């Protein structure tokens, strides 16, 4: 059990569409941000920035987890417009801050996905990477061994 801090993007913000959502998929991402301090809390603040344009539900680092959006709304992260990526899936971001431990962040993320699958009846097969929707190289550090990553969710 990892601690999940809720810090919802305010209603009204540009990056919070508010469109109703019934998640059927779960999209895994990698911030691709190696800067020091670029953790979960950092992304929560970043997302509440009035000029931010993207948005997702969870951000994971080696220490804890932040929720930016309710699970009944969508976010912009799968880069596939109104496709199921953005409109029917829970977006999760795994931090890569050089001052943290990616392996530990991944273990925390695997726990979150497992719990998320049980609460919204989402099969392991519907746990896909960002690359599944837009074809972009994301999660970069996870793609190479993607099958092994899912095998560890349990
Ligand atoms: Zn991504």
UniProtKB/Swiss-Prot annotation:
Reactions mediated catalytically: Hydrolyzes the link between N-acetylmuramoyl residues and L-amino acid residues in certain cell-wall glycopeptides
Cellular location(s): Secreted
Gene Ontology CC annotation, any one: extracellular region
EC id: 3.5.1.28
Keyword Acyltransferase recorded: no
A Gene Ontology biological process term: sporulation resulting in formation of a cellular spore
Principal cellular location given in the protein's record: secreted
Domain spans labelled N-acetylmuramoyl-L-alanine amidase: 45-140
A Gene Ontology molecular function term of the record: N-acetylmuramoyl-L-alanine amidase activity
Keywords: Cell wall biogenesis/degradation, Competence, Hydrolase, Secreted, Signal, Sporulation
Signal sequence annotation: 1-44
Keyword Chaperone among UniProt keywords: no
Family: Belongs to the N-acetylmuramoyl-L-alanine amidase 2 family.
Function, as annotated: Autolysins are involved in some important biological processes such as cell separation, cell-wall turnover, competence for genetic transformation, formation of the flagella and sporulation.
Name this protein carries in UniProt: N-acetylmuramoyl-L-alanine amidase XlyA
Species classification: Bacteria, Bacillati, Bacillota, Bacilli, Bacillales
């Amino acid at each position: 059990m990892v601690n999940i801090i809720q810090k919802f993007i305010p209603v009204g913000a540009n990056n919070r569409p508010g469109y109703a959502m019934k998640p059927k998929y779960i999209t895994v991402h990698n911030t691709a941000n190696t800067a020091v301090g670029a953790d979960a809390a950092a992304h929560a603040r970043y997302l509440k920035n009035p000029d931010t344009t993207t948005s997702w539900h969870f951000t994971v680092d080696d220490k804890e987890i932040y929720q930016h959006l309710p699970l009944n709304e969508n976010g912009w992260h799968a880069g596939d417009g109104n496709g199921s990526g953005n409109r029917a899936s829970i977006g999760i971001e795994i931090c890569e801050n050089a001052d943290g431990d990616f392996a530990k962040a991944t273990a925390n993320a695997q726990w979150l996905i497992k719990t998320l699958m049980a609460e919204h009846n989402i099969s392991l097969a519907n746990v896909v990477p960002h690359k599944y929707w837009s074809g972009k190289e994301c999660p970069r550090k996870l793609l190479d061994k993607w099958d092994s990553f899912k095998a560890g969710i349990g």
